């Protein structure tokens, strides 16, 4: 292990983490970026926030961190604290209320060729427009826009590792089914600054809600109330119980409005289908 | 003069906590692991989160930190901050709240012979997918997955600790005297297994971890007392409507529809507890 100690002493003798890890200032840093979705923690329809657990794999070459393994006892790879080297400052541009950048500074794997792999975890809370038109049978499309905050495409270049996010270690979700997932790279150049392109990678997920919870807890009671509402007209008037029955159905719906409001998304972007059905049942009782 | 200071200077004046304690790069560090559960704090069904309090016993060998008690006046143990020694960096992989590490960075105990012991306590919030089918008469299988965050299986491997009789502790250890059972959850089983995977040539370097499977049982007394029994009685009341007279003053529909209203109240009550 003394070879590794000597190596780490040698490499970081005059190393600068402020300075980009290239050999010419005209060089561009290539970062390969991959997203692994470990878990879809929660979709908040009211605030339109999707919270997920991710690993953000980043691969790039550091040209001041090369060595010959033969000169150091055959050591070919080492582990370095990520705070000790330059890193790309990938930021979640559409972060809702979470952390903008990586805050878990795990160790990087440094190879003798200068290749660095850094796979920190993160909890991404990303603003996702929620279309409640078909709720609880709705389909969402949640993106995660990632980019170097302070570096433009002329100094740091980012490319996706794969066409799709890595879902191999994805935990099963009890509320959503990810039908589709895909990552796209975008470059935007402005007329004012035509020599500083701005790059991003957007990972979008298309997710279908599993509606059994709302079917059991919401739709079936309203269906019962709606069904029971027509049968007061088979009651005789002389029994003196028509108003009792109908008013009790109305009171049951009024109590059920507690369940509706606590469960239904409290947003005004559109009328949910379940809300339409609730209003229909109320109006017709 | 305290011989501890001389021993500390001897062990740490030339020491690299960033390098593994291996004489060659391809040698593996073996870690002896035990996990002792102090309290099962809770299982949130809405968040599907198991909150537990544990402490992890982690033993290994550091040849650089080896010493003899004869050369240092009979010292058999030295407590030092854990930041001064190499650590295997064990983390709970299946945490839900983003908290990978331990709660308190306790001292490591360096024994003569190069044996290093670290016993930090931790509060862990882990993912536990709740099987809802038989709620509240349900049992859950919550995993606790421990692994090195940095090193692959060829660099750091795991073994289970042994008790004084030499038997392998391949489970969650619980001190019976100090244990207080959770008010709602009873821990029935807790086997531990050391898994190895990604060992193929195409899969790259091999990986390993330790998975403990807390098989826990719910005690449904609260739901029986407060929800199920009242709901059963109120739902049986509708059978009484068949015996009331079919006249103006029978109040047959009164009984039936008001039982429905009470059941709606129970739906509102139950919506605050069931998983989502």
């Amino acid at each position, epitope marked *: 292990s003394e070879h590794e100690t000597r190596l780490v002493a040698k490499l970081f003798k005059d190393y600068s983490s402020v300075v980009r890890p290239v*050999e*010419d200032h*005209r*060089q*561009v840093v*290539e970062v*390969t970026v*991959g997203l692994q979705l470990i878990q879809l923690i929660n979709v908040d329809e009211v605030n339109q926030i999707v919270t997920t657990n991710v690993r953000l794999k980043q*691969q*790039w*070459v550091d040209y001041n961190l*090369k*060595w*010959n393994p033969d*000169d150091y006892g055959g050591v*070919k*790879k080492i582990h370095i604290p990520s705070e000790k080297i330059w890193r790309p400052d990938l930021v979640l541009y559409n972060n809702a209320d979470g952390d903008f950048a990586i805050v878990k500074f795990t160790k990087v794997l440094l*190879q*003798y060729t200068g*290749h660095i792999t850094w796979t920190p975890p993160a909890i991404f809370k990303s603003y996702c427009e929620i279309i409640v038109t078909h709720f609880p049978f709705d389909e969402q499309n949640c993106s995660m826009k990632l980019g170097t905050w302070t570096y433009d495409g*002329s*100094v740091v*270049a980012i*490319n996706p*590792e*794969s066409d799709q996010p890595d879902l191999s270690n994805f935990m099963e979700s009890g509320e959503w089914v990810i039908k589709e997932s895909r990552g796209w790279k975008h470059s935007v150049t402005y007329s004012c600054c035509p*020599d500083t392109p701005y790059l991003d990678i957007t990972y979008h997920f298309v997710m279908q809600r599993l509606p059994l919870y709302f079917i059991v807890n919401v739709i079936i009671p309203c269906l019962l109330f709606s069904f029971l509402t027509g049968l007061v007209f088979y009651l005789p008037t002389d029994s003196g119980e028509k108003m009792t029955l109908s008013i009790s159905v109305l009171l049951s719906l009024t109590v059920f409005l507690l369940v509706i409001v606590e469960l239904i998304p409290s947003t005004s972007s559109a009328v949910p289908l379940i809300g339409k059905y609730m209003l229909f049942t109320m109006v017709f009782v | 003069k305290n011989e501890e200071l001389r021993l500390y200077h001897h062990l740490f004046n030339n020491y690299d906590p960033g390098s593994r304690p291996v004489r060659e790069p391809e040698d593996t560090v073996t870690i002896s692991l035990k996990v002792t559960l102090t309290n099962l704090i809770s299982l949130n069904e809405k968040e599907e989160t198991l909150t537990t309090s544990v402490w992890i016993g982690i033993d290994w060998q550091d040849y650089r930190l080896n010493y003899s008690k004869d050369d240092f006046g009979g010292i058999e143990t030295l407590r030092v901050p854990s930041e001064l020694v190499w650590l295997p960096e064990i983390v709970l992989e299946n945490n839900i709240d983003g908290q990978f590490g331990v709660a308190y960075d306790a001292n490591v105990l360096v024994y003569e012979g190069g044996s290093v012991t670290w016993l930090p306590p931790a509060i862990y919030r882990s993912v536990c997918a709740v099987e809802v089918t038989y709620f509240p008469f349900d049992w859950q299988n919550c995993s606790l997955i421990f692994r090195s965050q940095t090193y692959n299986a060829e660099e750091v491997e795991f073994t289970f600790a042994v008790d004084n009789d030499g038997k392998t502790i391949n489970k969650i250890d619980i001190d019976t005297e100090a244990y207080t059972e959770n008010g709602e959850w009873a821990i029935d089983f807790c086997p531990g297994v050391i898994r190895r995977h990604h060992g193929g*040539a*195409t899969d*790259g*370097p091999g990986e390993t971890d330790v998975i403990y499977s807390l098989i826990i049982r719910r005690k449904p007394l609260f739901y029986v007392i407060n929800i199920i029994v009242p709901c059963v009685l109120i739902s049986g009341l509708v059978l009484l409507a068949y015996f009331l007279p079919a006249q103006a003053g029978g109040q047959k529909c009164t009984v039936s529809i008001n039982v429905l209203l009470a059941q709606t109240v129970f739906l509102f009550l139950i919506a605050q507890k069931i998983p989502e």
Partner: antibody
Amino acid sequence: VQLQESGPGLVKPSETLSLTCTLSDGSISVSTYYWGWVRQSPEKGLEWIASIYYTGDSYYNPSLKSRVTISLDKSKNQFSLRLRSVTAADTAVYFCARDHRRSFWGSGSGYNYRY
Amino acid sequence: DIQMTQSPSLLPASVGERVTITCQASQDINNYLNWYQQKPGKAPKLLIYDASKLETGVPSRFSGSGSGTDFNLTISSLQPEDFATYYCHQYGNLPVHTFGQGTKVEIKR
């Protein structure tokens, strides 16, 4: 960390020479690397055959372009060469190599590359 | 279609002598040239890149020069582990590569 060749050491004439290169502790989906093949013979010296990018872009020696097919397998982190219509002139030591690409920014021209 | 020509095809030398190896391009390639060293029965090792820059870990005696159609690889003081075959490698903006014929260096007697 390391590249490892594999394939038969003897190919009859008119058959296809098939070789594979495997990576040790490394992925083929990196944007600053091309993966290529270079054959050395005593009569022709070092000679580059073909190179391929992880997105499928491929470049070929003009002399060997017709007979050469370079392919990837990202699942297993391998890349393979197929040289068809093989003859005695193709007896050689075939290396698999990592063509390391550096990028540079030019004002008004975009990215230019060195290898 | 750039062709590289190395010179001499065989360079006898001895330890301590200053050694020079020339490479020449048919066209002008700016400084888009690297130099490799290959021991017998071993893969080539990169020595110089961009025709003048030394790779990490290489001994400082190796030097490279040339900013046009003609390039040089110079060994200031030949070491007994410097006896190897040296190749000049030309690349372009795209990954299209050509190599020199190679220059063998033997101990002189």
